[PDB]
Design a protein around this nucleic acid. Structure first.
Ligand SMILES: *O[C@H]1[C@@H](O)[C@H](n2ccc(=O)[nH]c2=O)O[C@@H]1COP(=O)(O)O
Lengths: 1629, 182
RNA sequence: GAGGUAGUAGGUUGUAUAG
RNA sequence: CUAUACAACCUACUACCUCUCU
């Protein structure tokens, strides 16, 4: 909007507040709410003086002692201060425990306080302040007459307390102007004060540019022939209606005559428009028949007038047509707006409908006139339609035909024209209209639409009271002649440049210094309530008999410039102003502030962010799914572990042997045990399996798998005596591997070669046996058996063999009992469940089509069972799928799945229709025994989970190598990991009153017995009469309107600096033409050297707020710049000799939730992302100490965003270390000594399919051939799943975060910071030092020495410099005085501070300009945001309920909100010590705290602002965002004072957050809208709002069908909707 | 017959021996259509028939693989009041123009009889209401009501009741006069 | 063991809405 | 980033059909 403003328009209430702080004061302001805020803040400011002087403060008011409830101002001083404030009851009898010696502020009657001074129960010298409520009352003047005339005047001015009177405005005194001035002068001499006025009215009359007021009369009206007929018909109707008998038409009469006699016939029928529209309803709405006759005869009279005026210019015969009958009038106003052809023309009235019809008139004259085209012009539904229409009208005109509402509070851009069509009867409304024209030049129009001499006397009164207002007030405005001579002087002066070689740089001079200062003041971080301005003191001094002015400028508290820019003296005010602002601009550019994304970091790799080359062009190709998002997936290789590559046993090499030791720890439940089998412990297997490898496997955790026998723990154990293989032992073990993973498990599939001499995924698995003596070793005779029994086809034995052989049970006990008559090519392998002796081939068949089993096998197959006396076999199906990692009967939450029914257990336990019965001579015993088959089907999940643990140990190896985080190769035997377990347990009316005080009363006069016509009054009246009549202020009725729009350089130095000579600077300058700012400082230093004594005078209300920096000393410094046990958050274990995080947990963070496994990254991912934010915040704060928080948040959002975490993930290549699909042994798992080619998937998509033609065979090998041969054999005729798996980019970022969380959980926040350095985003300072003697030792953090032996050791967090801004002589003493009364804030919070600058920095708003000693809360808010974020995330991660992803993020996102923080702030009184000089913030916080104490300080986020049964509907409750920021900022301040310790912050905030933690944690209460949505998913709706007429408030209604419509109110839409849903829930409870 | 051809062909072969084995070969990883492709490996020892099938569903992929295996083998109201009165004015006829071309100052034309002729002419009636009380001036007044769509009252006053009704009909004649002229 | 219908439990990807 | 609804897909279960085994 570019408010290129004049000097600094400060907050006008605060301006009056500072004037009250200086001298005794009568405040000229009308609104009593603003006057309460000023009174409250002045009490707060003098509270410190009252305490350290042992004094008291008295507030005298009028309504006190009448009504039983306490007054409003008492409620504020007990709610929003820390002050001991006392209220006197109507006819108060003194209780014995009550005293004024121990009350801070005493609100008392004037009669009561008069009695106190009479009886010495309160002493006047002990009184610091006396405040008089509405002291312009005559009655209270008489009441304080004994008070002042007996006690205040006889007291010396040394002992006189400071006096404030909250009077009404001086255009509201209820006197004539003569007697007004007399009442004034008697009033200032009476109460020993002065009028301080400084309203918005005064602000525009002096601080804003002058609008020239032009006054155009309006002539009375006569009638032409048409209007003679109109007047004739109307007086006939009036003279009839006087005699019409009925033993509101006069309103239509009395308005229709005026619109006839003031505008003419066209507007007469366009008022007949409105009045016949009224009568068309009001003749039907009446019940009385004669009143109906009267209303309808008035309606027919309007029909007459409309018929005549329609028969007048559309029938008898159009700008000449409208100008003919209707009087011109508005021509001069139109020419006033035509000469301005940036114009923001505003027209003001007092009726809404007049504003609408004038908007329509300006609209139609915009479309009609070609020169005027540039003018851009219960049941709450119609209220919103009207509100939306009016704001649409306001947007169309402003980018304003206003009314009385657009007078105070509304902010608009600067204007050229303000219109008063309505003749102003009131000065207050007149100058609130006039207050907007500011564009310099800008104009004001008065339209008066003898008596002219009397209105001339009235504007003489208005100008004269304007002169009294400006004259008796605060610091003035310099006249425009000084700006004229500044415009003269600045014409030839050349601007300062930031770079002197660059001529075309930033041009800044005296003529644009103030604009740059004000734009910088506006661009600081601020919310709506904050108004950042700079405080400008001027000072008179005399040099060579010539008057000069020093101009101490002070920039806001948010800006990092914390000392006073002192200007150097110039002849007048305005040149001192421009020089002070230009010295401030150069002083800014010395520290580089001239003006988020503009800021960049101060350390290199932070601003580098090196993109990978093809990933870079992936970033600039925005059509692709973006990197760091879930929508882009990359296919990574599954890394076979380091210990499993190139470890193949070769002949001669001694080899490591590990027994895969299984141990059943939990037998299967009998509810799970459907078929009721014997439980087989896998440690009872005489034959197990073993792994032969030449590279030693490190120490690994024992993990659990879940087969039919139940939960079986898996571990690996080294054999002591090594194995050396011969060639034939290599051949038989290769045949064994091909047999076991081709035929016993059939894991071998197509495109799959057993290659024993591989380099990758090359290891041996051997059939081990328990030694009969003891121990385990390689079963050599079993290997001989597998050599003999290779891929031998099952043979159909003849009848003679079965006749020959009897049945041996031990051949068929504990063995795989495969039938030979069925399934010849792919035989079905069967366990032994039971051997039934009672059954036989002649035993009874269950089915009906066959009799006994011998007849069955004779019929269906043709085979004769030779021995019918043999016992039979109940058998089971063998394990089809071989994934056993997830337990078969548990959900992910640990909730058991439904087991089988008892009927379907027992009925199918003994029936022969189920189960499976076999004949032993009709079966072949497979060579593998059955317990060996159990561990043999256990194997593939063992191999996949060991490969997972070893990839996690490889990540731990890589960090401990590249950064010294633990032992490199953990090969010590006396060390074990934690077990891999999955977690699965198997006030408006007061504003109306102050409006009433403005409108109707405005009364009261003391005396008249003196001589008020002191001639000088009549002289000033006649002078203003002559100046208005002759000066063009009075435009007469015949006059139309007025829309009007050298010196030698050394002599210029004498004129401009009168304290130098003519020949001194002749030789001093020489070649130099103009003295630049440094030269001017040198010249003033030379003059203060040549004139060593300097004097200074306080001019204006350059305030006594600040002191010290600009005052107090007053000694020549005046011319230039002279670990809780119940779980911790900062749990820091040792880093020297610590093995680090277990590969169990690193594996947990590696494998996603997509893999369906019982271990997940997600909880560790949440704690990791939260620590990433926390540590980047704390280091970002301590690094860039002067930089405000917006740029630091932009740096952290450049840090933590998952594109950068994805870049660090691909740089460390974590895609090739994770698990992306559930382990399924037939499809996604390459067994030892095989390979899958990658390119045939391009040959698999169509291409090579007329028919087969190849059946492998022709492509014998692809890996051995080169890629040219690969592409050839592909072309002779979208990812691998066996060894590759697809992972999305955001999941890689999730793994980086979860890995940070894993390192956090085991090796502390310091380990997480070092691991954060490991990833690539820096968080710790590098100290790049030369070589530390013993390179083999790495102290934790120290990377590898380079080619020139340099370690780059990572150092700790520096301690940040405290923002106690020593630019004052006694900044510590001013800190101690300004921070008074914070001790009970500390006791209400808990933690005593060491450096109280952090306290004040936390509890200073950005507005509190009396504070020089710190900065605002926004830096500490930015810090305490992430400190509380991590504190909440880790206190909810450790919750033994074990929250899911969604549960943990819901619990935090409702535990971290500004409503929560504001509520917990207000409960412990964090509003009471929030030093703010912001008015709207004070009212918002005040009404919030009052209706929180109305809730009795219970933590309600929800039940203070609705009930439908409470009449709270006007002025609902306002939740302050600022006190939420105060709770965050005091969190940051506590964190910084603890030497950056989190356990102290949680030690404090347990007592402030733990009840709400347990309350929202224990029950899941859902979202309050969503809970009503879950109760009724098609019923509860939320309609559009409405805004009430109060000015801040919104009403939204919920409806529940057959349950009622529940009303709602909130300042925002969201709280109204939510609390409407909540009160619906309370009614449905 | 009409079921999954994997089951049909499994039973059809298992009547004549030999055990087929289906296998997953490629799960497709598309953005919103992650299809599956399976392959049947019938008798990889002797005469290997390995047939591929594409499909969004695993049942559909196995079905397509089985079919491939088989197939390779073989105001405005004051405005609105004004227009329909003009329609009543065209429905009136000639007496509107006689009303225009006469002077209403003279009482020799009988206002009540002329307005009754207008009522007879234009299919309406005229209502004359003389309320019984006396004014502060001690005279009489009447209202004439136009029995049409709108409410309709023209006023009149006089020293007697008959002169009051005559003046009311005179003002009604002024009314119907002053809409008439074009 | 295979094919099929329901529930029950875990999740992956979209579409829409609100903060 | 949080909440809700719908569609697909996957596998852990349970009860039951269509066959087979028995
Ligand atoms: O057919 C499968 C399953 O029904 C059957 N089985 C095995 C073992 C047991 O205790 N109960 C049982 O029903 O045998 C086959 C094995 O498959 P699963 O390993 O159970 O998936």
């Amino acid at each position: 909007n570019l408010h290129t403003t004049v000097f600094t328009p400060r907050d006008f209430q605060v301006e009056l507040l500072a004037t009250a702080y200086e001298r005794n004061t009568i405040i000229c302001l009308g609104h009593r709410s603003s006057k309460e805020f000023i009174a409250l803040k002045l009490l707060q400011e003098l509270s410190r003086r009252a305490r350290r002087h042992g004094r008291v403060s008295v507030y005298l008011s009028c309504e006190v002692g009448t009504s039983t409830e306490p007054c409003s101002i008492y409620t504020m001083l007990t709610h929003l201060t820390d002050l001991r404030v006392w209220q006197e009851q109507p006819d108060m009898q003194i209780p014995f425990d009550h005293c004024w010696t121990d009350y801070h502020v005493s609100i008392l009657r004037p009669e009561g306080f008069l009695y106190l001074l009479e009886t010495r129960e309160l002493l006047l010298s002990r009184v610091e302040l006396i405040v008089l409520e509405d002291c312009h009352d005559s009655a209270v003047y008489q009441r304080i007459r004994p008070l002042f005339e007996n006690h205040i005047m006889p007291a010396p001015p040394a002992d006189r307390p400071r006096i404030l009177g909250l009077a009404g405005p001086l255009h509201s005194a209820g006197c004539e102007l003569q007697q007004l001035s007399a009442m004034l002068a008697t009033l200032e001499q009476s109460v020993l004060c002065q009028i301080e006025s400084a309203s918005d009215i005064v602000t525009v009359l002096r601080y804003c540019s002058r609008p020239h007021e032009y006054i155009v009369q309006c002539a009375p009206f006569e009638m032409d022939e048409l209007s003679l007929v109109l007047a004739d018909v109307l007086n006939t109707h009036k003279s009839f209606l006087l005699d019409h008998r009925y033993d509101d038409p006069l309103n239509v009469i009395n308005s229709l005559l005026v619109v006839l006699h003031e505008m003419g016939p066209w507007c007469t029928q366009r008022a007949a428009h409105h009045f016949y529209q009224c009568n068309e309803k009001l003749k039907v709405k009446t019940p009385h028949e004669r009143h109906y006759l009267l209303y309808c005869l008035v309606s027919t009279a309007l029909i007459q007038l409309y018929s005549l005026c329609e028969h007048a210019f559309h029938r008898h015969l159009s700008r000449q047509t409208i100008e003919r009958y209707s009087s011109p009038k508005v021509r001069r106003l139109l020419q006033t707006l035509r000469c301005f052809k940036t114009l923001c023309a505003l027209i003001y009235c007092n009726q809404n409908h007049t504003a609408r019809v004038l908007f329509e008139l300006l609209a139609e004259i915009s479309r009609r006139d070609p020169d005027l085209k540039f003018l851009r012009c219960t049941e709450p539904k119609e209220a919103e339609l009207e509100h939306r229409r009016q704001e649409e009208v306001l947007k169309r005109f402003r980018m304003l035909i206003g009314t009385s509402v657009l007078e105070e509070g509304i902010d608009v851009p600067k204007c050229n024209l303000v219109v008063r069509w309505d003749p102003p009867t009131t000065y207050r409304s007149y100058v609130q209209c006039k207050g907007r024209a500011r564009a310099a030049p800008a104009y004001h129009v008065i339209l008066v639409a003898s008596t002219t001499k009397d209105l001339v006397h009235q504007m003489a009164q208005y100008r004269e009271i304007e002169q009294m207002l400006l004259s008796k007030c605060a610091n003035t405005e310099p006249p425009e002649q000084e700006q004229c001579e500044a415009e003269r002087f600045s014409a030839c002066l050349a601007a300062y440049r930031p770079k002197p070689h660059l001529l075309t740089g930033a041009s800044v001079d005296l003529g644009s210094a103030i604009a740059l200062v004000n734009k910088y003041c506006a661009r600081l971080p601020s919310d709506t309530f904050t108004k950042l301005t700079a405080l400008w003191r001027c000072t008179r001094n005399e040099r060579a008999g010539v008057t000069l002015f020093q101009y101490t400028l002070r920039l806001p508290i948010n800006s990092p410039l914390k000392h006073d820019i002192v200007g150097l003296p110039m002849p007048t005010q305005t040149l001192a102003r421009r020089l002070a602002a230009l010295q401030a601009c150069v002083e800014l550019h010395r520290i580089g502030e001239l003006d988020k994304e503009g800021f960049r970091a101060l350390e290199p790799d932070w601003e580098c962010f090196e993109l990978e080359p093809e990933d870079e062009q992936i970033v600039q190709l925005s059509d692709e799914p973006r990197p760091g998002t879930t929508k882009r997936r990359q296919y990574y290789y599954k890394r076979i572990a380091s210990e499993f590559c190139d470890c193949r046993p070769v002949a001669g090499a001694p080899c490591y042997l590990y027994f895969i030791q299984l141990t059943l720890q939990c037998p299967i439940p009998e509810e799970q045990n459907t078929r009721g089998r014997k439980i087989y412990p896998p440690e009872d297997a005489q034959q197990g399996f073993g792994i032969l490898t030449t590279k030693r496997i490190p120490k690994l955790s024992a993990f659990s798998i879940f087969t039919r026998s139940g939960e079986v723990k898996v571990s690996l154990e080294l054999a002591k005596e090594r194995v050396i293989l011969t060639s034939e032992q290599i051949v038989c073990i290769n045949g064994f591997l091909n047999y076991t993973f081709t035929n016993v498990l059939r894991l071998q599939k197509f495109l799959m070669l057993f290659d024993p001499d591989s380099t990758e995924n090359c290891v041996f698995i051997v059939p081990t046996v328990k030694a009969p003596a003891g121990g385990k070793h390689i079963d050599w005779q079993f290997l001989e058996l597998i050599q003999a029994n290779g891929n031998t086809m099952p043979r159909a034995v003849p009848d003679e063999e079965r006749q020959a052989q009897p049945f041996d049970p031990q051949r068929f006990q504990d063995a795989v009992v495969m039938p030979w008559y069925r399934n010849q090519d792919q035989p079905q392998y069967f366990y032994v469940a039971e051997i039934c002796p009672h059954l036989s081939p002649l035993s009874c068949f269950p089915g009906d089509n066959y009799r006994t089993f011998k007849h069955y096998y004779l019929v269906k197959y043709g085979l004769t069972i030779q021995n019918t006396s043999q016992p039979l076999l109940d058998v089971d199906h063998t394990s089809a799928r071989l994934n056993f990692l997830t337990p078969r009967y548990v959900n992910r939450k640990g909730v058991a799945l439904p087991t089988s029914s008892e009927e379907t257990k027992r009925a199918k336990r003994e029936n022969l229709e189920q189960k499976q019965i076999l004949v032993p001579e009709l079966c072949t015993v497979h060579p593998f025994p059955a317990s060996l088959w159990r561990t043999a089907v256990c194997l593939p999940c063992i191999l996949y989970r060991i490969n997972g643990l070893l990839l996690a140990d490889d990540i731990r190896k890589q960090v401990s190598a590249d950064l010294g985080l633990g032992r490199q190769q953990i090969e010590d035997e006396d060390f074990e990991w934690p077990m891999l377990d999955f977690g699965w347990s198997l006030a408006n009316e007061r504003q109306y009153q102050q409006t009433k005080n403005l409108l109707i009363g405005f009364n009261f006069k003391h005396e008249d017995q003196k001589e008020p016509a002191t001639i000088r009054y009549e002289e000033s009246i006649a002078k203003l009469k002559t100046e208005i009549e002759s000066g063009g202020m009075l435009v007469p009725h015949d006059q139309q309107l007025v829309l009007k729009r050298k010196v030698s350089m050394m002599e210029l130095l004498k004129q401009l600096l009168p304290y130098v000579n003519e020949d001194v600077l002749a030789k001093k300058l020489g070649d130099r033409r103009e003295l630049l700012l440094s030269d001017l400082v040198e010249l003033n230093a030379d003059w203060v050297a040549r004139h060593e004594q300097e004097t200074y005078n306080v001019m204006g209300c350059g305030d006594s707020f600040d002191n010290y920096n600009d005052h107090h000393r007053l000694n020549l410094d005046e011319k230039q710049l002279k670990l809780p046990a119940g779980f911790s958050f900062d749990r820091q274990p040792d880093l020297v000799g610590h093995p680090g995080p277990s590969p169990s947990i690193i594996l947990q963070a590696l494998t996603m939730s997509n893999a369906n496994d019982g271990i997940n990254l997600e909880r560790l991912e949440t704690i990791g992302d939260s620590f990433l934010k926390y540590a980047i915040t704390t280091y970002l704060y301590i690094t860039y100490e002067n930089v405000h928080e917006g740029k630091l948040s932009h740096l952290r959002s450049k840090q933590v965003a998952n594109l950068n975490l994805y870049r660090l993930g691909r740089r460390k290549r974590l895609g090739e270390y994770m698990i992306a699909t559930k382990f399924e042994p037939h499809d996604n798992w390459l067994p030892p000594c095989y390979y899958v080619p990658k390119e045939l998937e391009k040959a698999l998509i169509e291409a090579k399919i007329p028919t087969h033609h190849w059946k492998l065979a022709d492509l014998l090998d692809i890996k051995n051939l080169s890629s040219v041969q690969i592409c050839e054999m592909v072309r002779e005729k979208p990812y691998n799943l066996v060894s590759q798996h697809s992972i999305p980019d955001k999941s890689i970022a999730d793994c980086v975060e979860a890995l940070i969380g894993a390192y956090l959980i085991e090796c502390g926040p310091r380990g997480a910071l070092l691991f954060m350095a490991w990833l690539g985003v820096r968080v710790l300072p590098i100290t790049r030092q030369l070589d530390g003697g013993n390179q083999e030792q790495r102290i934790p953090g120290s990377t590898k020495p380079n080619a020139e032996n340099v370690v780059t050791v990572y150092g700790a967090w520096p301690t940040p410099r405290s923002p106690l801004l020593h630019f004052a002589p006694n900044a510590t003493e001013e800190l101690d005085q300004l921070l008074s009364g914070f001790e009970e804030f500390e006791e209400s919070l808990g933690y005593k501070f060491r450096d109280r600058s952090y306290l004040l920095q936390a509890m200073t708003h950005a507005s509190y300009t009396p504070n020089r000693l710190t900065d605002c809360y926004q830096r500490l808010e930015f810090l305490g945001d992430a400190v509380l974020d991590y504190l909440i995330t880790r206190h909810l991660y450790e919750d033994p309920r074990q929250h899911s992803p969604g549960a943990l993020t819901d619990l935090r996102s409702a535990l971290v909100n500004n409503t929560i923080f504001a509520s917990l702030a207000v409960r412990h009184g964090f509003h009471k010590f929030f030093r703010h000089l912001s008015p709207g913030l004070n009212d918002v916080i005040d009404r919030f705290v009052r209706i929180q104490q109305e809730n009795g300080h219970c933590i309600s986020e929800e039940y203070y602002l609705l009930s439908e049964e409470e009449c709270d509907d006007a002025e609902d409750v306002e939740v302050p965002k600022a006190l939420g920021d105060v709770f965050e900022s005091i969190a940051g301040a506590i964190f910084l004072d603890s030497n950056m310790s989190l356990d102290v912050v949680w030690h404090v905030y347990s007592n402030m957050m733990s009840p709400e933690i347990e309350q929202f944690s224990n029950s899941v209460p859902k979202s309050p809208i969503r809970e009503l949505l879950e109760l009724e998913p098609e019923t509860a709706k939320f309609g559009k709002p409405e805004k009430l007429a109060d000015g801040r408030r919104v009403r939204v209604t919920v409806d529940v069908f057959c349950k009622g419509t529940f009303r709602g109110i909130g300042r925002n839409y969201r709280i109204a909707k939510c609390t409407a849903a909540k009160c619906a829930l309370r009614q449905l409870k | 017959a009409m079921k999954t051809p994997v089951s049909i062909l499994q039973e059809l072969l298992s009547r004549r021996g030999i055990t087929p084995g289906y296998e997953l070969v490629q799960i497709e990883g598309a953005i919103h259509e992650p299809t599956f492709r399976f392959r049947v490996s019938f008798k990889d020892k002797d005469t290997p028939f390995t047939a591929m099938g594409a499909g969004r569903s695993k049942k559909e992929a196995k079905h397509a693989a089985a079919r491939a295996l088989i197939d390779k083998l073989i105001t405005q109201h004051s405005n609105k009041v004004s227009q329909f009165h003009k329609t009543l004015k065209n429905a009136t006829g000639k007496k509107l123009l006689k009303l225009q071309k006469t002077c209403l100052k003279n009482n020799k034309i009988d206002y009540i009889k002329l307005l009754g002729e207008i009522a007879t002419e234009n299919q309406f009636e005229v209502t004359y209401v003389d309320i019984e009380e006396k004014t502060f001036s001690g005279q009489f007044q009447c209202l004439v009501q136009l029995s049409t769509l709108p409410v309709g009252v023209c006023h009149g006053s006089g020293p007697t009741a008959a002169d009051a009704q005559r003046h009311a009909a005179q003002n009604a004649l002024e009314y119907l006069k002053i809409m008439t002229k074009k």
